[PDB]
Every structure is written in C-alpha cells, then in structure tokens.
Amino acid sequence: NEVGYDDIGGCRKQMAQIREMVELPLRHPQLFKAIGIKPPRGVLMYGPPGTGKTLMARAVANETGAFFFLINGPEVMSKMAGESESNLRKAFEEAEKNAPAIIFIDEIDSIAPKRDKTNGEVERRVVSQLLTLMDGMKARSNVVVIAATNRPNSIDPALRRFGRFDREVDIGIPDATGRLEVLRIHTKNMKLADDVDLEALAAETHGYVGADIASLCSEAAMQQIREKMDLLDSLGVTMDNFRFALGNSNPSALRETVVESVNVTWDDVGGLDEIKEELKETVEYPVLHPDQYTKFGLSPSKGVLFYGPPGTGKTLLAKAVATEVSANFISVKGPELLSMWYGESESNIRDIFDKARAAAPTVVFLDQLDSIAKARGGSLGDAGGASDRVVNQLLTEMDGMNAKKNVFVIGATNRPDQIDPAILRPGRLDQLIYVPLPDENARLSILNAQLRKTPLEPGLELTAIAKATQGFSGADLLYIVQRAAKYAIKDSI
C-alpha cells in the first residue's frame, strides 16, 4: 500500500531536479567514478506546508528500487536514559549494510533548532550526533539522505556544509496550469458529472496549495450525499457542489502569509491620463525588457515610495500598477508587528526578504511607516536595548540584496517625513513617484469608477457633483455617494 510515481502534478520542474539528484546516482554506481565527481549525499526540501514534502519523498523512493529507511521527527528524542543516539547510530549502520539505501528524515525542524533556543541537555546531544554521523558517509556507500522541513530559518545553520547538505530544493506554490494538473489526478476515482469545468476552478483558485485542492473535491462529494439520502444509484458530483465548496470553505490564508492576487484593471482610478505613463516603467519594463539593464549595467529600481492626499493612496494606487504580472502578494500590515517580545520582531521579516529572491516573482507591499521606525531612528533613539532591533534589518538587507531575480517593494504612507531618512538612502529609492490630488478633470471619472456595479441612470450629470468638490478628496466622494445608496434601498422599503 503505497503511492506511485506520476501522481504529482504542478511540481514537474522540481521533479526533474530531484530525479537526476537522488534516483539516477542510486541505481547507477557508474558515470560518477568515470567523471571523477563524487555524488551528493544530502538534499533539503522546504517550502510552505501542504505542498508535497512528505508525498514526493515516498513517491520518488518507491518505484526506483531502494531500502527507504523512514525516520520521523518527533518520534525520536522521546526516549529515556539516552538511547536516541543508539537509535540514530543503528539507523545509518543498518542502511549501508544493504546498499543502495535512502534515509528520509521527516520533520527535521523538530530535531535541530538554533543554539540560542536550546532546551535542556538532550537537545544538544542529538544535534551533535547527527552532525558527526553525517560526515561518516564519505566512503561512497551509495546512501542518500533526504531531509524535509517547513521553516528553513529556524533550523540550525551548521547543517549546510560541504558534504552534509549542499543542495536545497525549494517547492513553490503551483500556477493556474499547476493547480489544474492536481485536479486531474484527484478526480480519477471520483464519479463526476458533465456540468463541471476544471479550467474555471483552477482559474478561480489562485491562492490554493497542494493540500487545499484535496479539500475542494472531498467536500463537494460530502455535500452531495447530504442531499441524496432517503428510503447508491447515481452520485455524479455537480458544478453547484463545487461552487458551494468555494463559498463555505477557504484557502490556506488563515491570517498567515497572504496568498492572493486581488488587482484591478485600468480606468478604475479616475483620471490618471498623465500619471499612467509614470507607473508603467517599474513593474512591466523590468519584466518585459530585462536586457536593457544588463547591457548598460544599471541596477533597476525595485522600490518606489508613495505618499499623497487622504482618500486614495494605500492600495488602489499601488495594486493597479502590477496588472501584467499578477503574482503572489505577501504583505505586512497592522497586526503584523511586535507581538512576541523575543525573536519574532524581524524574524517574521527574514522569511520575507530571503524568500523574495527565492520565490520570485513576489511583490511585497510596505505600509504603516509611522508604527515601525518612528522614535527608534530619530535623534533621541532608543535607550536600553529593549526594542531597537527594528531599524537594523530594514537597512542591512538592502545592500545584501541584488537584482538577480524579480523582486519588487512598494512603500506607502500618509506621512513621508515620519520615516527614518536611511530608508530613503541612495541606490534603493532613486525613483520617487508622487501621487497628487485628483483635480476637476479626474474627480468626475472617480464617480464613474466607484459606481461600477450599480444600476446607474446615465441621464444625470456626475460632473455637477464633482464640480462642488474642491477640497473634497475621494473619501468625501465615497461619502457623498454612500448616502445616495442609503435612500435608494429605502425607496424599495
């Protein structure tokens, strides 16, 4: 009772990276001694949970011919009188006696934390046993060690050495064609009807993962048997069962890192007929023409500071710029602040900076600038070392990041002078784009933009409402139009 080999879709690029890595040198002792290169004896898999970490390791090891020594994370170290080292020493000794063998250490993050979060004395005893025994496989015993984890930053940094764990394999989220491929291999044994369309389900589900796609098919079948129950004849899953499963359920974004691509098209902010040409040169031209920076030698400005009047400015002036990319948007916001008093102040940002170049393309939005570096970066600063650990990682991660992959940051605030001036250092914020107040030629098209899904009578004049708005921004244009919809439903009442 095990899974096959071709039961994984969407991860085809990382499959071809790992089929030549752990499957080809295992079955072939030649073509490495002849080339004079020893094969790697360690790989590391990481990414978001529910993406296929524990599934791909059992699939790649079954239909190849191997020993497949399984070992779980939390099941070790739960022993008494210090015998977890003997269970680890007998694990690697019994594998090489009947080579070829595969040692898959599952959940390695529950075994090796960092040395500043050490607990007791038996946690140090099992991380130094693993580091010693990993170096003992240099005799070319055809033993490949696969390690799966969830957080690569919480692991101990002494595991990635020359020989222990050299290669790392990152598993990203599938695309629209990737999420469609998993839906084909999940509705194989299910009785389906004819009204379903798997292309529309993959296009609607953007921020879904490899585990959320299994919830979409299993909940629609459970919904259908709640209807068909009276005094097993025909149980074809309909389109309305999948449409109900999209409503009552939700994707993996349970106030975690947000996976969505909510963007609006053009002419949704009023006017912009002289401002739209200023925003097309920062998120489209590094993607459409990357060779113009490599031929010259300039660094592309991946950051644009935004500031403007009240009303608009936060999201609809920034999310309407990236209409052509539509990648995953991982944002920081209000509640994403210093909630834990130890460690989780910039470590929640360390997986945003380092993953922006690993999981490219990924757009990171930055807002609420007066709640992160207001008093700490000033002339008075912080005295005592209590929470002065916020203005350091925002500056030292700027020079350490180059324009190798598709990175993009956007800073927006209501007060541009309330942020530290080192955030506006040269080399990173050389392009300053200012969003101005909408004038009389733009405020009339604002009222035509936020009245989109309305049964609006075109016989009236929306210019006469906007002509009485001089110091009234788009929020007051939203204020004057909300009262017009309050008495409109009252006419039906």
Binding site: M80, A81, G82, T118, N119, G120, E121, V122, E123, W341, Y342, G384, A386
Partner: protein, 48 residues
C-alpha cells in the same frame, strides 16, 4: 516621563533517569531477607 518594559522566558527541564550500576546489583544479590519464625535453612555434611 517614560517607561522601560521587557518580558522574560524560561526552559523547564529534561531528564534521563539513569541509575543502577552493576557493582551495586552484584552486592544486592548476595544477602538475606529474613524468614518468618521457624523456617530454618540447614547445613548438611557428607563425602567422607
């Protein structure tokens, strides 16, 4: 006119419960435990 606030954190314990060296058990076997009232234990002789 200001404040300084800082929290703390702790780690409780781990244990092994290792005991019973072999030299204590070899002395633990060669002893007596007591015999009720009239449960003599005897002597014996022979092989002249």
């Amino acid at each position: 006119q200001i404040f300084v606030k800082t929290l703390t954190g702790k780690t409780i314990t781990l244990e092994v419960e290792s005991s019973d060296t072999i030299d204590n058990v070899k002395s633990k076997i060669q002893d007596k435990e007591g015999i009720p009232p009239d449960q003599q234990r005897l002597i014996f002789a022979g092989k002249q």
